[PDB]
């Protein structure tokens, strides 16, 4: 059958994708593009309004001496200019990040113990449900105890709420389903039994603070905001004195002893608090993406939905804004989630491994890394050499390095069932690719790549870690595009081939199994398309409090 990228290449160019020559310089530059033309017109309107020049197509070099391409968002039939995938222009991408940044998971297990032991009071499904009606009033920023409080406008904060989950079916089934992430409904039966066994009789809150607050403030706000309003709702629903010594144990539990941040804080050169992208480990990113609980019969679809989640967050928002800015890094990321290119390569590798070894049944060793990562690296590279339109599509070496090595590293982990030999296959792919084409990525692309083989299995202080625990703050990974989202995909790959319900943290997996999110985490690439088409509705906007 056609390679999976052929439909997209036929849409991009007039030539068939195998054709070797074209013509350039006749398209009228920016005037070929609907989107560029909208930008030129907007630039002139902005500059007049504010009295300062702004976007001008005659500054610098003239874009569009070649075709300015559409991109197919992979797994969709949506084709858009790449500007519609820039995070600034795509409200689904912004919301995906806000939904992560404004979430925290907070236990009720120490809290319920403080109530039974220090206060000497009972906890039951009934007193939990009362507590959850109270905290769902308080959490968006409304009052429960003092007189003369002034509050947030409910409609500005309609995306903030608190749910719970537990492995104890009999407590879960008895609370108002309005408040419960129901593991049995949300997960197929095998995955539900694994998750309920991990959670056991623990009861956990998933707290989402308002998107308008997260945007005004930062990620480190989230666990504090959550704890203030859990603390108020504990006082109101359990009849404490409104501020006694025991109140401090609820605060320490909700802020530190039974909190799970999405991201941990960063070192001073890149200083940031909790719940910022650099603190999110790759294992968590894979668990936030919900493809695993929908697409589990297709480990390649689960893995590549994780790569799309991570490439957009880590490369476009984190590296391309928090850590840089400007035009930024849209197409370093879109290479991993458009034109079905990574999908073609990775489905090739999956078939290779399923035929040769069977999924997860290759030895977990360097012989398997050498076999699978080299075979899938040469397949992907051969496609750029057989299809000159594919090479002109993924025109930057770094894009090609990330895509070919993601397919090689994922397929290696589909063979071994272990992410660490997957990571070794990613690095081997880079070294083979560099020698095949006498280039790899941008000037600084392979800092991690050359440290890479040696640090995969090291045990030393700031070198050794399973891939699932690494993240954007692992030292070698802290700077460069075209790696972090792909590493999240590799972390997912052996778990998806094994049928595991989660990669690194079961609580995180359950916490995003929730259709009350604004972004739909079960279909990340579908959401990116919806945002690109201007059809996604984000939270956080101020229209209600601004003039008509």
């Amino acid at each position: 059958a056609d390679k999976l990228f052929i439909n997209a290449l036929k849409k991009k160019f007039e030539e068939s994708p195998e054709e070797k020559k074209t013509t350039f310089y006749t398209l009228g530059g920016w005037k070929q593009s609907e989107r560029k033309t909208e930008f030129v017109n907007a630039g002139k309107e902005v500059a007049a309004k504010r009295g300062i020049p702004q976007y001008n197509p005659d500054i610098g070099t003239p874009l569009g001496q070649r075709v300015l391409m559409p991109y197919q968002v992979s797994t969709t039939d949506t084709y858009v200019e790449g500007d519609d995938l820039h995070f600034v222009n795509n409200a689904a991408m912004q919301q995906m990040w806000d939904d992560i940044r404004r979430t925290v998971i907070v236990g009720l297990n120490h809290a319920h113990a403080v109530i039974e032991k220090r206060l000497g009071k009972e906890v039951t499904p009934e007193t939990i449900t009362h507590y959850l009606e109270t905290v769902n009033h308080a959490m968006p920023g409304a009052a429960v105890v003092q007189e003369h409080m002034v509050e947030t406008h409910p409609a500005l904060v309609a995306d903030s709420y608190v749910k719970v989950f537990t492995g104890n079916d009999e407590i879960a089934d008895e609370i108002d389903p309005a408040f419960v992430i129901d593991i049995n409904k949300q997960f197929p039966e095998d995955q539900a039994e694994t998750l309920k066994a991990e959670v056991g009789d623990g009861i956990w809150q998933v707290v989402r603070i308002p998107t308008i607050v997260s945007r005004t403030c930062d990620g480190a706000t989230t666990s504090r905001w959550s704890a203030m309003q859990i603390g108020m709702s504990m006082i109101s629903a359990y009849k404490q004195a409104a501020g006694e010594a025991a109140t401090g144990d609820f605060a320490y539990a909700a802020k530190h002893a039974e909190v799970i941040h999405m991201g941990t804080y960063l070192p001073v050169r890149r200083a940031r608090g909790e719940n910022e992208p650099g603190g999110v480990p790759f294992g968590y990113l894979a668990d936030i993406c919900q493809s695993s609980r929908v697409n589990y019969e297709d480990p390649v679809r689960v893995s590549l939905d994780v790569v799309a989640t991570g490439a957009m967050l880590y490369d476009q928002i984190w590296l391309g804004s928090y850590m840089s800015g400007g035009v930024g890094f849209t197409q370093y990321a879109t290479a991993a989630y458009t034109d079905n290119i990574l999908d073609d390569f990775t489905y090739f590798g999956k078939e290779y491994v399923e035929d040769k070894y069977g999924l997860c049944e290759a030895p977990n060793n360097m012989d398997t890394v050498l076999d699978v990562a080299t075979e899938v690296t040469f397949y992907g590279l051969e496609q750029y050499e057989e299809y000159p339109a594919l090479l002109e599509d993924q025109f930057g070496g770094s894009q090609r390095a990330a895509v070919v090595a993601a397919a090689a590293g994922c397929s290696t982990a589909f063979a071994t069932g272990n992410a660490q030999t997957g990571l070794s296959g990613w690095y081997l792919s880079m070294y083979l690719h560099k020698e095949q084409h006498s280039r790899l990525g941008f000037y600084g692309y392979d800092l991690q790549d050359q440290c890479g083989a040696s640090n995969v299995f090291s045990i030393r202080g700031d070198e050794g870690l399973p891939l699932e625990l690494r993240g954007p703050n692992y030292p070698n990974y802290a700077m460069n595009v075209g790696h972090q989202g792909e590493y999240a995909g590799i972390s997912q790959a052996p778990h998806a081939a094994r049928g595991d319900a989660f990669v690194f943290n079961p609580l995180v997996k359950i916490a995003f199994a929730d259709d009350n999110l604004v972004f739909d985490f079960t279909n990340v690439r579908g959401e990116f398309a919806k945002g690109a088409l201007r059809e996604f509705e984000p939270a956080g906007e101020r229209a209600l409090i601004t003039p008509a």
């Binding site: 120490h110 501020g243 109140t247 401090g248 941990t264 480990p281 272990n418 399973p466 625990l469 703050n473």
Partner: protein
């Protein structure tokens, strides 16, 4: 001697040990026992061999609720502890007869490690203790069981956690009384970032020894921070002696006189009487039925008032056998004494201020917690320069079981390992002995 003051030193039963010790014999800059304690605290690590084994067997590494399915490794670490510990020790030491100690506890479920002092004399700071210990145990476990290159990274995760993705050793199965250098609120703060529950656990809840260890650590940080340099030095040394070292048996005798029926206010009355009897303060002025006291020695008034503050904590929270009211004692001992006398309270109001925010952040929704989770580096309790946290240590030593976040809950690993060390457990005894030894060298 730069200062002429002498003090009488006692044991934790109120018996005299040594009379007329020059004040500087208690200085952290001179006292060899405080030097040993501080270097001990920098170099000692608790290793939880059982916890490493269990984290490997379940693949639960990298922090709370984290687990990597398919990565499980079942290794008989505790049953091979002796061999693992010996192989770790040969990497940890510098030479064979140096001061490295590696000692199994709990049937090999734990190890006390003291990394050799010499590694610190050529280091900038103190992180060599956990980092040298961690790698030596990760390498000794890999070598004991010939763990493969493919699986060894799980041993590293079980020992040291999610570092370096996380800044801290998140999920580690080792523990130290110090915390990482990046968590200091300012330069010079490392000896202040030691949980109060860790000091109470190391001293086995002996009230005077907990207060001594806490004071030694706080006032030694005051030197490192430069606060005890120049004009302020004597004030800090007298605080150390009288609030933390029971100099002249002042704290002890106040507690004895007020322990059966006393309150914070009765302790105050006694301390003001004692300060007048000793000539530390004198009536400066009469108002209408009200004496205004003055002093010609503010450092000594501050020290006497500090001893009274400690005694008041011991009376007040000792009578409740409940630590929470230490925040109230630290506030109203100082508020009452300034209206009782016309003189400034301990640390010129900064104990009272620390106590106002400490009270709020131990009885409110916004942060803090119970007394035992504070420390001199905590934002709520950093403000007094050594005169508040030792009272919190005494109060948690006297708590009979009212805290959820008790030393049993937060500091069990620390208690098993660090209470083994005689100078950490009974510092009042070793610092006073060393002071008596160097008494003629000051």
């Amino acid at each position: 001697a730069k200062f002429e003051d002498k003090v009488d030193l006692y044991d934790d039963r109120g018996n005299l040990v040594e009379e007329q010790v020059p004040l500087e014999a208690l200085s952290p800059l001179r006292n060899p026992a405080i030097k040993s304690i501080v270097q001990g605290i920098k170099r000692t690590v608790a290793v939880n061999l059982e916890g490493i084994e269990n984290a490997l067997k379940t693949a639960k590494v990298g922090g709370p609720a984290c687990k990597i399915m398919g990565r499980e490794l079942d290794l008989d670490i505790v049953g091979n502890a002796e061999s693992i510990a010996a192989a770790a020790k040969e990497m940890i030491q510098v030479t064979e007869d140096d001061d490295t100690n590696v000692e199994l506890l709990g049937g090999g479920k734990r190890a006390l490690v003291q990394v050799p002092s010499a590694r610190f004399d050529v280091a900038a700071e103190y992180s060599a203790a956990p980092l040298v210990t961690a790698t030596a145990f990760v390498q000794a476990i890999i070598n004991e069981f010939d763990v493969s290159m493919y699986d060894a990274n799980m041993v590293k995760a079980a020992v040291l956690g999610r570092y370096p993705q996380s800044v801290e050793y998140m999920g580690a199965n080792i523990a130290t009384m110090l915390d990482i250098p990046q968590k200091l609120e300012g330069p010079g703060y490392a000896l202040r970032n030691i949980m109060v529950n860790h000091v109470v656990a190391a001293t086995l809840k002996n009230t005077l020894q907990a207060a001594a260890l806490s004071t030694i650590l706080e006032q030694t940080a005051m030197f490192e921070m430069g606060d005890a340099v120049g004009a302020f030095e004597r004030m800090h040394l007298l605080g150390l002696a009288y609030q933390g070292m029971n100099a002249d048996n002042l704290v002890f005798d106040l507690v004895k006189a007020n322990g059966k029926e006393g309150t914070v206010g009765s302790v105050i009355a006694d301390l003001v009487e004692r300060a007048l009897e000793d000539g530390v303060i004198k009536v400066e002025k009469e108002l209408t039925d009200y004496k205004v006291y003055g002093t010609d020695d503010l450092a000594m008034w501050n020290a006497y008032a500090a001893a009274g503050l400690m005694a008041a904590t011991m009376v007040n929270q000792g009578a409740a056998r409940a630590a929470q009211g230490v925040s109230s004692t630290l506030l109203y001992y100082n508020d009452l004494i300034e209206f009782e006398t016309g003189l400034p309270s301990v640390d010129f109001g900064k104990v009272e201020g620390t106590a106002v925010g400490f009270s709020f952040f131990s009885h409110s929704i916004y942060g803090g917690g119970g007394p035992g989770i504070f420390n001199g580096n905590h934002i709520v309790t950093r403000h007094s320069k050594g005169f508040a946290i030792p009272c919190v240590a005494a109060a948690m030593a006297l708590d009979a079981g009212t805290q959820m976040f008790s030393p049993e809950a937060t500091s069990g690993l620390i208690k098993e390992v660090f209470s083994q060390v005689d100078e950490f457990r009974e510092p009042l005894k070793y610092v006073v002995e060393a002071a008596a030894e160097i008494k003629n060298e000051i």
